[PDB]
Symmetry: C2
Subunit: 300 residues, 2 copies
């Protein structure tokens, strides 16, 4: 089939260092593919979609390895950028539960409007576009201004990076904030479940088509500007690794949209994807598939 | 058609610098590391045909470590890619160093069986450099099968050096720092007054040549045949101390292979160390005979 999805976002090398026996201590150090956009792209390939990553890595060899590893999970990485003389962005975590974390993502800024415009007609012929908020405001504005009626799904990434979305909700098809992100955007505290209707009305008054609000233990509240809303309860999971849960949920939303699925069922399915990510030791679960998510959901 | 063989570990060093002081912005640098791998790179840069015998895992980042190493001149074609293992790494949080993690278990994949599959190739090298990251069995194998090829040994750390203690009579040149020499000999190196005694210990235990680096005090060198002396440090603007010992070791082995006398080899080696010290990286990209000679003649 000649249908594809375009993901525009960041590709990181995650580095986790675990202390044992808590100067130079022995321990375990794991390099993994990371970055919200790259992760999403990988989950979409595993969900069986033709996925193209538009992203940036540097010439530091390890950048090329990141791309290669990503390509092997199914992702089309050929249009990605290899920036001369820059380092490949990275997310470093010192664990024991995370003690300290460093965030080195300046190369995100190389994902420019000029870069994207050189692939304009290719982006405009995608079935859906997914964008994360690691990219600059100019680059996100470019995507939203040139989507040519292709739905743009936006992953807000963090309370800090989500704000670039506030003035452009009327250009985003589906937004998936967590509690802190939705509070930051709307300026309305999400104290309890009682507050979500008000926060959702805020998002829709500001032009957002569809809100997928994840509220942790409280579940997911979903709301469509056309009137449909509801709560979906969490899928009980024994959680091994929370990293990648949101990336899984975003991938499942977009895949379900492209597959022709209704909103409420797409949200439940997305929750299942997330659940698969949660019970896996990795940022992405290699066993994520329509089959297994369907099996995980129907058994509930 | 002459070459040098280096047997040791190949790491990815990761330096994370906390910037403004949770998820903190900062800088994270991935670089090639590992004593053996570093030495091999310095030897290629000094113009020698250098072959690395080492182990990396199948984690893609391993393959690129090899590729980057190769790009610096090193023949990486005989290295091991261990299925379903991770590439060893040295993680550092820095500003001075706060914490550092050491993940080097793949070192154990550099086995006696592995080396024996390249036995005749190792036995035709001009010199063999081995680091003490490898297991005691693997180091014993090298020393037992060097077939009269000189083995230069980098002791790596006070912890890892001890595997050398019972086999000094098989090692051509050993390059310990103060702490390593103290750990091996059991003789404290309190002041300069102690080196003669430490050196006599090493020679009574069969070591051919000692190159003892004493930090600020310089380098003390001693040959079992009688020659010994102090060489004063090369006054350097130190930017990055990582890699200084690896440059010094490379320079010793290169100078030996080049036919140089001991004392001149030590001065030259110090110059290499100096180039490494004044550089931002674990290896200086500008390391060369030309530049070391030019640095030394002053
Ligand atoms: O600011 C950011 N921090 C962390 C990530 C990545 O989130 C992944 C989990 O969702 C994780 O891989 C990290 O690299 C990002 O893309 N932007
Ligand atoms: O036990 C060890 N710690 C650190 C290193 C490496 O030393 C390099 C500097 O000499 C540095 O690259 C590290 O990887 C090693 O090989 N073994």
């Amino acid at each position: 089939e000649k249908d594809y999805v375009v993901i525009i976002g960041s590709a990181n090398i995650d580095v986790a260092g675990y202390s044992h026996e808590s100067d130079a201590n022995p321990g375990k150090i794991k390099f993994t593919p990371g970055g919200v956009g790259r992760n999403i792209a990988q989950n979409l390939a595993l969900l069986g979609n033709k996925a193209w990553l538009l992203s940036a890595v540097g010439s530091d060899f390890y950048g090329q390895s990141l791309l290669t590893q990503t390509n092997q999970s199914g992702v089309y990485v050929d249009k990605c950028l290899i920036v001369p003389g820059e380092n490949t962005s990275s997310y470093l975590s010192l664990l024991d539960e995370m003690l300290v974390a460093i965030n080195d993502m300046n190369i995100s800024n190389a994902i420019t409007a000029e870069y994207l415009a050189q692939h304009r007609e290719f982006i405009q012929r995608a079935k859906v576009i997914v964008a994360d908020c690691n990219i600059s405001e100019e680059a996100l504005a470019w995507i939203l201004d040139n989507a040519a009626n292709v739905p743009v799904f936006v992953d807000p990434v963090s309370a800090w990076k989500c704000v670039k979305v506030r003035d452009r909700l009327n250009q985003i098809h589906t937004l998936k904030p967590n509690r802190l992100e939705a509070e930051t955007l709307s300026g309305i505290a999400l104290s309890g479940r009682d507050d979500v209707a008000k926060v959702a009305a805020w998002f829709h008054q500001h032009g957002l088509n569809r809100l997928v609000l994840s509220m942790g233990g409280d579940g997911v509240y979903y709301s469509d500007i056309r009137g449909e809303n509801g709560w979906s309860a969490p899928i009980k999971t024994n959680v091994i690794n929370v990293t990648g849960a949101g990336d899984a949920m975003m991938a499942g939303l977009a895949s379900c949209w492209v597959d022709g699925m209704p909103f409420a069922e797409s949200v439940r399915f997305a929750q299942g994807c997330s659940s698969m990510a949660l019970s896996c030791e990795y940022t992405n679960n290699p066993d994520l598939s329509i089959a297994n998510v369907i099996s995980l959901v129907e058994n509930a």
